[PDB]
Design a binder for this molecule. Sequence first.
Ligand SMILES: [N-]=[N+]=Nc1ccc(NCCCCCCN2C[C@H](O)[C@@H](O)[C@H](O)[C@H]2CO)c([N+](=O)[O-])c1
Length: 765
Amino acid sequence: LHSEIGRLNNQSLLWGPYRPNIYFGTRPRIGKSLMTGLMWGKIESYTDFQHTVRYTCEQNEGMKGYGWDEYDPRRGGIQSIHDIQNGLDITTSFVKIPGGAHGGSWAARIKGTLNDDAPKDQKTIVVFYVSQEGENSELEAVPSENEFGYEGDVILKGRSEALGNYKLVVTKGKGVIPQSDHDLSRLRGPGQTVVQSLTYPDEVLWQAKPILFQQLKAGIDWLVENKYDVADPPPPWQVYLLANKPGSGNVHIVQKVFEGDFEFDILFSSESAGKEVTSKDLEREVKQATEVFGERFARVFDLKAPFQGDNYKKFGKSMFSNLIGGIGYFYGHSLVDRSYAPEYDEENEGFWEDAAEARARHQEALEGPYELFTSIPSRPFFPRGFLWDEGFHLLPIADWDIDLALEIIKSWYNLMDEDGWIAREQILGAEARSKVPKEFQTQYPHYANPPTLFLVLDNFVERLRKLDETLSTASVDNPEVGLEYLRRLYPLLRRQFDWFRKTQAGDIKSYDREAYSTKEAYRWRGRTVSHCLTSGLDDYPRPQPPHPGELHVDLMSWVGVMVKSLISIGSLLGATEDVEFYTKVLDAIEHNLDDLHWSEKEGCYCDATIDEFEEHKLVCHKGYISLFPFLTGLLKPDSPKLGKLLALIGDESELWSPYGLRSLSKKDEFYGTAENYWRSPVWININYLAIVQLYNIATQDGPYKETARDLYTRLRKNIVETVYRNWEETGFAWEQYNPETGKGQRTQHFTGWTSLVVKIMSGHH
Ligand SMILES: [N-]=[N+]=Nc1ccc(NCCCCCCN2C[C@H](O)[C@@H](O)[C@H](O)[C@H]2CO)c([N+](=O)[O-])c1
């Protein structure tokens, strides 16, 4: 039955608009298969379309905003795009229609409405680009009846092992098609839908813009060659209209030009499903998906006071849909340094110089291929999987559809190598790599990232203890299914645990260090003079200079998180010998958190280093790091330490701004210095952890119950309002928020752990 649920999940999730790196496109969760993508741009001159055309996601002054209004990967959704440069408000509706044996069918409607500023007679070029990778597969454009192009629908017939037989239709659509009275219309037609069918080597099919432009350029060359010149030039839009040439290939370009408003449909009909998909099907299925999305939201994300109003609901829906709508499927080789150079052990003083030297050997090479199914932080700026981000992303997604989240956790864990390492940044394939400077592609097997994915697992466990609707919760509703999932995952979790203790070990024994345990001590590998990228808190201030004697209280706390998870999951699978070992590790981290990391002088936790004189020194920088044992759920609800931490959190002159907790204290010498990434701004992921822990203490008997209740109430309020206020005014979720002004800053489209705000509003943790 676990095998059955798994198959039903596969079939359910196979198709989607799983190319979040582009405004709109589809691919199934198959490495080498059928992909589609949308392009559009106004054309006003002979040279503008190359600058106006849209394809891959960006965010500049020419784009007001875009995002998903509603989305569920099992059903589909609606995206809206507000494009200033091209004077166009666009809607892309996508819907899935289950059936057959090949992952069902799907349809999309592309609707373009000129805005009030646009010339009413704008010419807009629209392209539907279709590619198919694979050795023994075929795809053919059924030729036109008419001679220069299509009056009606374009039908592509294709086949592959993965998808069986299928047909993909691009409908005639609605709107004015401009007509040219030029001489050229005798050879090229007055103006009509055209198709070019081409073949390129499989590995470059992803390069849709260059492929299209190469065709446009050959068209213009043909004009030049055939005496079409500036004495008497055809209109721009006709100059940029491809000569119709449908046939067989692994690339099909479908081009339309519209004057004024337009819309057209794309109908993917899986043959094995029987009756083929129509436009009326699309419409009906689109209305149904919305109704269902509506009913689930109200149930899963029931916003508590004072956020019950419709404005906050709209806000919630937008933050949630953008997060779950970012889900992508990624496939290909990634770039890894597999030298295990001994400089990466970072055992000496000045280790960062040695590690640089090793990197300068450039032993990195492509390996794989790998696949990942994941949500992402940022469509426009970094549309790819990040390990500790995904932990936060799945908290709201798990609420919505636990089986989806588990599917994604599983996807992540299938990347883990024999040592127990998952690269913290997954850049899979040439497409993914295109967005990333080569200097920043290489992953390093000694680089950790927080194991926040355990938090999702913890939530699943608590849920497990206590048609698409069914599937979304099959792994909790059938405890048999759930347990088997943990059984299969469990060894990899343990593997990762061991990998942390092996590769991210700190040094107790070589120094004058006294502590309850000789074992428990941790130091993030990969730190440079100004940075510790692997911790997630890029430029939060750390001991200077970096030093092999360093210990990092955030890292120990994460190890505490994992061991507590391993206890619960172990105990579920009766891995007694394991649960006893974990118990002793937990006990030891608890003592060593205090022995090595507590500052009585300062009233908080600190990282530690080794003196100019070989002694253990604490290095306190009051901020997120200082709160870690609290954030990670490690302290007892009556700890006097916790109570001091509550004072630090609530203290306006340190951490507490009107807009949320500051990453660093205003008192800290490093406040608002350098790039000021994690040195003051308010970050929603850490604030979310604070909010959850405050609420925990608030709903339990103890000395801080009421203190927590006040802080919880205010912090929830402050964080939600800041993110709402910015969304209201800018249309965007931001990466981080300014504690002085409350303004969103750094990158937009950060959905992204900023979307945790839906869960904060939802409450009842
Ligand atoms: N103008 N334009 N603006 C930009 C700005 C940046 C940019 N690239 C950024 C590549 C690394 C992204 C790291 C973000 N986060 C850091 C955080 O500290 C971590 O904790 C967290 O895990 C990660 C992931 O969320 C690009 N671009 O196109 O590559 C265009």
